[PDB]
Design a binder for this molecule. Structure first.
Ligand SMILES: Cn1ccc(C(=O)NC[C@H]2CCCO2)n1
Length: 185
């Protein structure tokens, strides 16, 4: 792919984070804490899952960023509507305003309804995310495997401003403590 030149500098929005997340001072890394991180509750925070949004809002153009997932067992990544539900249980689907992929139990899947099996020969350590707002496209790339395509959502109906979306996953196993990191441009 030749999307690197649409690179954007993403930072995480503390105010949207689940109350157990720890966001680094530079707002470029997030991990699961072992307890509540001593913040007040607010209507923006994801309550049920270890999720957080980027601060940036996109309503036009082409955007590209990269995320480091090294040594994680579980995570979700992509974009979502600014108006997605924050509280209670929900599925990651385009009907609910999410365009995402994930790792779970040694398999990679795209957040369609129902979910789609991904075919990855080289487990990725870094994921590239490309959004073309006007075209209605969200694509995922395997940076570890020379940028190979993972998945394309096309005919997307964004229906609002988009925000970068992250889920660090639970750490019931003790094997999923590692952070998500936004990689330098
Ligand atoms: C499950 N559910 C429905 C609505 C809410 C909500 O807004 N909670 C946030 C807090 C902290 C201050 C006000 O309430 N949570």
């Amino acid at each position: 792919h030749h999307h690197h030149h649409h690179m954007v500098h993403i930072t995480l929005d503390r105010n949207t984070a689940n109350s157990w997340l720890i966001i680094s001072k530079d707002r470029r890394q997030v991990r699961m804490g072992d307890t509540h991180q001593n913040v007040s509750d607010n209507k923006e925070r994801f309550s049920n899952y270890p999720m957080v949004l980027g601060a940036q809002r996109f309503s036009s153009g082409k955007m590209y960023w990269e995320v480091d997932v090294t040594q994680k067992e579980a995570w979700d990544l992509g974009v979502c509507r600014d108006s997605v539900q924050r509280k209670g249980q929900f599925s990651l689907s385009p009907e609910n305003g999410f365009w995402t992929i994930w790792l779970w139990q040694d398999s990679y899947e795209a957040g369609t309804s129902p979910q789609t099996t991904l075919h990855i020969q080289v487990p990725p350590c870094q994921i590239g995310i490309f959004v073309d707002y006007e075209a209605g496209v969200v694509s995922f790339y395997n940076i570890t495997d020379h940028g190979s395509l993972i998945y394309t959502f096309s005919e997307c109906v964004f229906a609002g401003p988009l925000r970068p979306f992250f889920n660090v996953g639970f750490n019931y196993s003790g094997g999923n403590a590692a952070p998500l990191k936004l990689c330098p441009l």
